[PDB]
Coordinates of C-alpha atoms in Angstrom, one line a residue:
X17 CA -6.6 -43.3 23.5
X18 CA -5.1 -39.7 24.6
X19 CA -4.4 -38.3 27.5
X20 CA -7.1 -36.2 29.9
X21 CA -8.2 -35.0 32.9
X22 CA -11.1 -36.5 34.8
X23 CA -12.7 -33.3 36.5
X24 CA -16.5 -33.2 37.9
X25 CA -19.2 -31.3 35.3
X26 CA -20.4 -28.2 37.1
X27 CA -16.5 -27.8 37.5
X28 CA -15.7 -27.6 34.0
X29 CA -15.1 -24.4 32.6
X30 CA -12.8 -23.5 35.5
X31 CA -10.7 -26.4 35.0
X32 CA -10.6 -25.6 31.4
X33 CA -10.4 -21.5 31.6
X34 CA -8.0 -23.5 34.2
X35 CA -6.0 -25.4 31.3
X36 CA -6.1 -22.4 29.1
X37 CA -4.0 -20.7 31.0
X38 CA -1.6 -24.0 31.8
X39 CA -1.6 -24.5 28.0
X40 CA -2.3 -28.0 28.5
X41 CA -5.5 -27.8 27.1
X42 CA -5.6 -29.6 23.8
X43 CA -8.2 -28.8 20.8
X44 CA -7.5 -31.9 19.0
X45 CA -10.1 -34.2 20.8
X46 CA -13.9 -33.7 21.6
X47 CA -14.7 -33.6 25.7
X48 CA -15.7 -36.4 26.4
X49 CA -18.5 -37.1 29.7
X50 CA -18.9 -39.4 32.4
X51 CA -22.3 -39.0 34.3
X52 CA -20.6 -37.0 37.4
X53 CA -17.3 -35.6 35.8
X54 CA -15.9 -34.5 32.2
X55 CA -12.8 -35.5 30.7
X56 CA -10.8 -32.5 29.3
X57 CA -8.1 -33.5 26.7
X58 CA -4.6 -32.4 27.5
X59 CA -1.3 -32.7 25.8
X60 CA 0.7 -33.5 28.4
X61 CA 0.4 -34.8 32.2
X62 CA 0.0 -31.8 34.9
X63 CA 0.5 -31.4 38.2
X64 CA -3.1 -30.4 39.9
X65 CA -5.3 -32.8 38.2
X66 CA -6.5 -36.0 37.6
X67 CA -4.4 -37.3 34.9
X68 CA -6.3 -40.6 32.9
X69 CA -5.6 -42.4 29.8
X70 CA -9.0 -42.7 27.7
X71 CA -10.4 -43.0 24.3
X72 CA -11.6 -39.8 22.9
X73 CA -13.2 -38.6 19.8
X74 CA -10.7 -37.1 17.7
X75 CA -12.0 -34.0 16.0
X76 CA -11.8 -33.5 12.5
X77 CA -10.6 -30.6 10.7
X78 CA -12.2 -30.6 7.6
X79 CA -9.3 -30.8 4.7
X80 CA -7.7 -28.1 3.3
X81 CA -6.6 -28.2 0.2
X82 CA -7.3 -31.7 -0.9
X83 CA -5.0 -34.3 0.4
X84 CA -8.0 -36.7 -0.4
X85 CA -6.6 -37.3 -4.2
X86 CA -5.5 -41.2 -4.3
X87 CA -2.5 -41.9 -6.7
X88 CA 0.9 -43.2 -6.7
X89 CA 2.8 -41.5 -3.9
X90 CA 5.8 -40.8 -5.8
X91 CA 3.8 -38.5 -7.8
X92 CA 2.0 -37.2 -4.5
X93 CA 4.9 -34.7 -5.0
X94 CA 5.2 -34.1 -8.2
X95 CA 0.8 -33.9 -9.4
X96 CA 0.0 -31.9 -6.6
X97 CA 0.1 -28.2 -7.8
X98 CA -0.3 -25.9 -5.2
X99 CA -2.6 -23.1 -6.6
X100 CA -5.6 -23.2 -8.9
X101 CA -7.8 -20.3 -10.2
X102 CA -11.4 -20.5 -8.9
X103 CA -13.7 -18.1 -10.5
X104 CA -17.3 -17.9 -9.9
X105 CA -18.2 -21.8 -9.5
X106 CA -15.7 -23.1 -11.7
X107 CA -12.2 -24.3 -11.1
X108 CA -8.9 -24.3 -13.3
X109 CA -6.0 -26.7 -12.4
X110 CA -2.9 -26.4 -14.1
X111 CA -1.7 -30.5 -14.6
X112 CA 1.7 -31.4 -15.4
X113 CA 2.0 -33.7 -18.2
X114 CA 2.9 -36.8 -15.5
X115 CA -0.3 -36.6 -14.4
X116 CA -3.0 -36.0 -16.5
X117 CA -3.6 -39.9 -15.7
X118 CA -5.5 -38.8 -12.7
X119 CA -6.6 -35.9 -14.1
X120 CA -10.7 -37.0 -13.3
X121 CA -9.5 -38.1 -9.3
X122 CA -8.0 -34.7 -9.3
X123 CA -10.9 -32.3 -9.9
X124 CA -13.5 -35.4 -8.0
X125 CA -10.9 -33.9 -5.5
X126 CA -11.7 -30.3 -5.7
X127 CA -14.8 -30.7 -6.4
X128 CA -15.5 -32.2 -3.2
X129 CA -13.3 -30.4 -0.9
X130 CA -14.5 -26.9 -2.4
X131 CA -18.7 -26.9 -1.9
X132 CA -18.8 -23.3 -3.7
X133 CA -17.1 -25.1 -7.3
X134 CA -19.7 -27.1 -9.4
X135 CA -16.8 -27.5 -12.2
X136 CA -13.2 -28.4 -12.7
X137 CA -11.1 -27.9 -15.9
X138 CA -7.6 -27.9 -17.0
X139 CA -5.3 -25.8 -19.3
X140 CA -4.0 -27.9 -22.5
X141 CA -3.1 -27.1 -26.0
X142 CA -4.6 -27.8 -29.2
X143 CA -2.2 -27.7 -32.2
X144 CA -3.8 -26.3 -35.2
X145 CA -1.5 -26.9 -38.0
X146 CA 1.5 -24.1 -37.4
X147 CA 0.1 -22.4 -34.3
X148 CA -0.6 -24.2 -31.2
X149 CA -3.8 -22.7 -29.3
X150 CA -5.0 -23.1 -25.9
X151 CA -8.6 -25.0 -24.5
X152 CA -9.7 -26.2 -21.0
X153 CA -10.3 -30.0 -21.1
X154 CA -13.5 -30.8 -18.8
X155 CA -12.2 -32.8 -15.8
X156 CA -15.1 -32.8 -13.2
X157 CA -18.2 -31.4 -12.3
X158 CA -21.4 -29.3 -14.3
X159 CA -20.8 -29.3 -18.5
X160 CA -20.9 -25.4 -18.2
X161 CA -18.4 -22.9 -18.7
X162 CA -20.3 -19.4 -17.7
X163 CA -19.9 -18.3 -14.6
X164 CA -20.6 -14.9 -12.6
X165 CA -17.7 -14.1 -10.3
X166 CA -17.8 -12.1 -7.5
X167 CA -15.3 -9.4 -7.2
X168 CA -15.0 -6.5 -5.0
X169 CA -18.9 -5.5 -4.7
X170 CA -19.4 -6.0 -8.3
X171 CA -21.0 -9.5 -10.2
X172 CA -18.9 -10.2 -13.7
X173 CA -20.3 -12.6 -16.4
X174 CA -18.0 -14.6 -17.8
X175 CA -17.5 -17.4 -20.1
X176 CA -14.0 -18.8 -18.8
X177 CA -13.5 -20.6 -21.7
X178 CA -13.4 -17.2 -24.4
X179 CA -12.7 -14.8 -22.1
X180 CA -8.9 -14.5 -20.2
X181 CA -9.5 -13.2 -16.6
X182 CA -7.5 -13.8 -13.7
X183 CA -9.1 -13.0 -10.0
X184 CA -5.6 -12.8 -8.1
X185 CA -5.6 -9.6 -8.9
X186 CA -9.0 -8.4 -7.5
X187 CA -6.6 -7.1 -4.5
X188 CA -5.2 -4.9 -7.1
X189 CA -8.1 -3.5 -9.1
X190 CA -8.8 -2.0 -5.4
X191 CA -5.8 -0.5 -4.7
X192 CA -6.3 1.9 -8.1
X193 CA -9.8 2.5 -7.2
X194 CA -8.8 4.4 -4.3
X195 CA -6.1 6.0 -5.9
X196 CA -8.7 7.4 -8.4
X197 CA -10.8 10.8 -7.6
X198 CA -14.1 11.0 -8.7
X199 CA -15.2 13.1 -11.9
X200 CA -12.3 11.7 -13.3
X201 CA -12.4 10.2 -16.7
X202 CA -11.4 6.9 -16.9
X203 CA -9.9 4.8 -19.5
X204 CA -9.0 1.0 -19.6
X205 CA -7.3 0.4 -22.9
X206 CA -7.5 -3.6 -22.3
X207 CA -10.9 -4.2 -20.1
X208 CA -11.3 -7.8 -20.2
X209 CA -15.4 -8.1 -19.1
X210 CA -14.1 -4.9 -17.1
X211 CA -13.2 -6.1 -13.9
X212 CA -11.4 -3.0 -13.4
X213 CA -13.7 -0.7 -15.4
X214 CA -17.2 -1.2 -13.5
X215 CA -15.2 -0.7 -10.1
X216 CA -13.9 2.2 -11.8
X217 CA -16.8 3.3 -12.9
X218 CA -18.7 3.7 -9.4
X219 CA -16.2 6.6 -8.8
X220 CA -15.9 8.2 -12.6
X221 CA -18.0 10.9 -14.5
X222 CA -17.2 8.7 -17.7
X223 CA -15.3 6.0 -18.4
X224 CA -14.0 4.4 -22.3
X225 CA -13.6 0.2 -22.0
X226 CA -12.0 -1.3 -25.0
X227 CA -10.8 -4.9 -25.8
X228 CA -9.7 -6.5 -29.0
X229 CA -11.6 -9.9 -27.5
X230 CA -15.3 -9.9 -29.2
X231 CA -16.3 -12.2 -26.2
X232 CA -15.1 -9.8 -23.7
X233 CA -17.0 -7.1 -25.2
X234 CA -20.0 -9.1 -24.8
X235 CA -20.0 -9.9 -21.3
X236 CA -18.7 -6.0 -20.4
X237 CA -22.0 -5.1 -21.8
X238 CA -23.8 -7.6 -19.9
X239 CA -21.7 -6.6 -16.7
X240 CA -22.7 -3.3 -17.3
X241 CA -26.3 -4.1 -17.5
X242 CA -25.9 -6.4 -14.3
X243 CA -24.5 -4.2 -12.3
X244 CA -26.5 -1.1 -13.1
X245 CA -23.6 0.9 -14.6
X246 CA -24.4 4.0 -17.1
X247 CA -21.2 5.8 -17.3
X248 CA -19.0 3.0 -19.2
X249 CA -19.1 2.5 -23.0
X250 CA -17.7 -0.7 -24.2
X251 CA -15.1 -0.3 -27.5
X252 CA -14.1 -3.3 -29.7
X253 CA -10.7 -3.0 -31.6
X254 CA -6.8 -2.4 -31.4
X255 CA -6.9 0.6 -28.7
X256 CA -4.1 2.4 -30.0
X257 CA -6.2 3.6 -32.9
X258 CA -8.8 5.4 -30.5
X259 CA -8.3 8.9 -30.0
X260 CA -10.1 10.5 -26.9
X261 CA -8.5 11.9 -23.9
X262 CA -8.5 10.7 -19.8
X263 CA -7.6 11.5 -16.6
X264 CA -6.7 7.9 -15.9
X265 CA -5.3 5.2 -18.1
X266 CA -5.1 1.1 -16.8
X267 CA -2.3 -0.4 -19.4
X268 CA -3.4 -4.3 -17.8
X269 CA -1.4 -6.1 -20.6
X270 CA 1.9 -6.7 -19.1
X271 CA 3.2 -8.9 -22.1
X272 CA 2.7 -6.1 -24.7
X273 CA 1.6 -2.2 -22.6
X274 CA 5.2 -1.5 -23.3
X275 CA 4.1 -0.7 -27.0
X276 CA 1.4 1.1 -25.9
X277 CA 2.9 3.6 -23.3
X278 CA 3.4 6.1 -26.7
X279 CA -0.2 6.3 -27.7
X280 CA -1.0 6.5 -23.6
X281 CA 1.5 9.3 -23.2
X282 CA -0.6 10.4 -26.1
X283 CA -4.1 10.3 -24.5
X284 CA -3.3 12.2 -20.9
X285 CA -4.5 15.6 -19.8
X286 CA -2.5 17.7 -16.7
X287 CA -3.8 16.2 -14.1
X288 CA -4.0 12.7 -15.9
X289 CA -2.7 9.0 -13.7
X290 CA -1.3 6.2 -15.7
X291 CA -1.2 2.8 -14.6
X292 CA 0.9 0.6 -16.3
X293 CA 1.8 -3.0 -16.0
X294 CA 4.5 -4.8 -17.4
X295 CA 7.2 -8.2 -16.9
X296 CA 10.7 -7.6 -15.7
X297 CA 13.8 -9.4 -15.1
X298 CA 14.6 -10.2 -11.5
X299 CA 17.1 -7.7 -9.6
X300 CA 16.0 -5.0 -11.9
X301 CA 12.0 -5.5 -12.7
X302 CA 11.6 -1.7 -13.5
X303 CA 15.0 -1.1 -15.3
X304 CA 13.5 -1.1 -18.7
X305 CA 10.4 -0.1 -18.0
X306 CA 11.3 3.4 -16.3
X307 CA 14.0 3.9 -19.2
X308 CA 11.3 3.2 -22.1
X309 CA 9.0 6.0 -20.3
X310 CA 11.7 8.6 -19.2
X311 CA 13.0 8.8 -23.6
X312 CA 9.1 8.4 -23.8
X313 CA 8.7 11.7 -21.8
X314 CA 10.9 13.2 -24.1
X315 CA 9.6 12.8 -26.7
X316 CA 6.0 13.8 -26.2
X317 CA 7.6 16.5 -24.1
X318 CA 6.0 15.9 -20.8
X319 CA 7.4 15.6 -17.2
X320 CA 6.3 12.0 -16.0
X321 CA 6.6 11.2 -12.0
X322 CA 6.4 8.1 -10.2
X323 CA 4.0 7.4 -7.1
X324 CA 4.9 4.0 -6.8
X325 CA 6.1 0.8 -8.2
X326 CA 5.4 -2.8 -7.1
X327 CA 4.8 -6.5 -8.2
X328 CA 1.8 -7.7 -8.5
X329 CA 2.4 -11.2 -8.9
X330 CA 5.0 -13.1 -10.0
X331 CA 5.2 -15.1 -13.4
X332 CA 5.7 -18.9 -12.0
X333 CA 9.3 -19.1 -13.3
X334 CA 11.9 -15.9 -12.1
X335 CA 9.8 -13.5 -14.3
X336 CA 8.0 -10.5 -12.1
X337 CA 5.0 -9.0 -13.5
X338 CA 5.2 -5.1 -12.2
X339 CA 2.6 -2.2 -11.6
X340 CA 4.1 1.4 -12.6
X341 CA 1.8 4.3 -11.4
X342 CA 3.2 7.2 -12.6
X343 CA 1.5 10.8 -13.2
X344 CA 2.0 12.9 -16.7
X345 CA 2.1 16.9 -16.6
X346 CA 2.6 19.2 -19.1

């Protein structure tokens, strides 16, 4: 039982435009109806109405996130990680190693609590011999790893499995498309399936996509077919050894662009915008970064100007990944 306020039917509304106003009325339980008056649900006792006990229908709020896992509550804190990647229908947990146990009640979990995933995996290694390489065990849901993922306007194939792709930073790809004119040419020296590059390429005369990934190159070419794109040409192999010229350059390989800036400074006409994205310590994520591409600017002799520099996300322990937009002129 809660509290309410017994209050005749045709009076309703009133009392509760009534309550609004009070702030007494309360949206945790359902009205509840008596043949000649309501019973409006308030969280505390007030002065102008007829204050009863009486048993009311809770409302639910449907869960978010899921609290529904079952396990031992100790872990409760420690297996509960607090962000997943969801692309398309399928779901990517990251497990700590004290939990893997429940791995299946996990992503039954997600599953459930998500209706738009029809998979869940998670991210473990496989040791080879020397090298260690990574794999998505198959935790709940469908036995598929393909998936079209919907971006900003535009539908990506994608096999999450051979392909890397991460959809955090869809709020990102936007904010270069709007820094780019049309006409321009455009060139994404790491595309991925060309997340960035089809958005790109609604707003660019031509546009070069390379990747060193096969796979990637595969599904760029069936992105490009499925969303009726023409001015992209998809390019498989190290991008430094391709020699055309752009208006726009997308460096999304933070872990390595910083050897590329020399071959980007290399590929950039007057007018020419170059994104570049890159990991940096905390108190000084743009320290290196702006020193490498100052001596850089030297050397090719050009004069290189900042527009703006920002985080886009931060690596999960006190590592920043950053996002340097800065244009070349000669």
């Amino acid at each position: 039982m809660t509290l309410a306020v017994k209050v005749p039917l045709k009076e309703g509304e009133i009392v509760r435009r009534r309550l609004i106003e009070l702030g007494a009325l309360d949206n945790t339980y359902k009205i509840k109806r008596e043949g000649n008056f309501l019973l409006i649900p308030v969280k505390f006792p007030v002065k102008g109405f007829e204050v009863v006990e009486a048993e009311l229908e809770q409302v639910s709020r449907r869960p978010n996130s899921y609290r529904e896992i079952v396990n031992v509550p100790q872990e409760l804190r420690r297996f509960l990680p607090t962000s997943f990647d969801i692309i398309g229908n399928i779901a990517i947990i990251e497990i700590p190693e004290e939990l893997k146990g429940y791995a299946k009640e996990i992503g039954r979990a997600i599953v459930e609590v998500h209706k738009n995933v029809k998979a869940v995996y998670m991210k473990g290694s496989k040791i080879e011999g020397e090298y260690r390489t990574r794999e998505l065990i198959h935790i709940a849901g469908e036995n598929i790893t393909e998936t079209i993922h919907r971006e900003n306007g535009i539908r990506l194939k994608l096999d999450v499995a051979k392909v890397y792709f991460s959809p955090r930073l869809a709020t990102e790809r936007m904010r270069v498309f709007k820094m780019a004119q049309e006409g321009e040419v455009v060139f994404d020296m790491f595309a991925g399936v060309g997340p960035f590059s089809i958005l790109l390429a609604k707003k660019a005369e031509l546009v070069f996509a390379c990747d060193i990934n096969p796979w990637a190159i595969k599904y760029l070419e069936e992105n490009i077919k499925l969303n009726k794109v023409n001015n992209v040409v998809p390019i498989l192999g190290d991008s430094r050894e391709i020699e055309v010229k752009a208006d726009r350059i997308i460096m999304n390989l933070p872990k390595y662009a910083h050897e590329f800036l020399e071959h980007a400074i290399s590929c950039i006409n007057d007018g020419g915008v170059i994104h570049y994205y890159g990991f940096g310590p905390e108190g000084d994520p743009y320290g290196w970064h702006l020193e490498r591409i100052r001596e850089l600017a030297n050397k090719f002799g050009v004069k290189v100007e900042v527009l703006g520099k920002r985080v886009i996300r931060n690596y999960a322990p006190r590592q920043y990944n950053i996002a340097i937009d800065f244009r070349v002129s000669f």
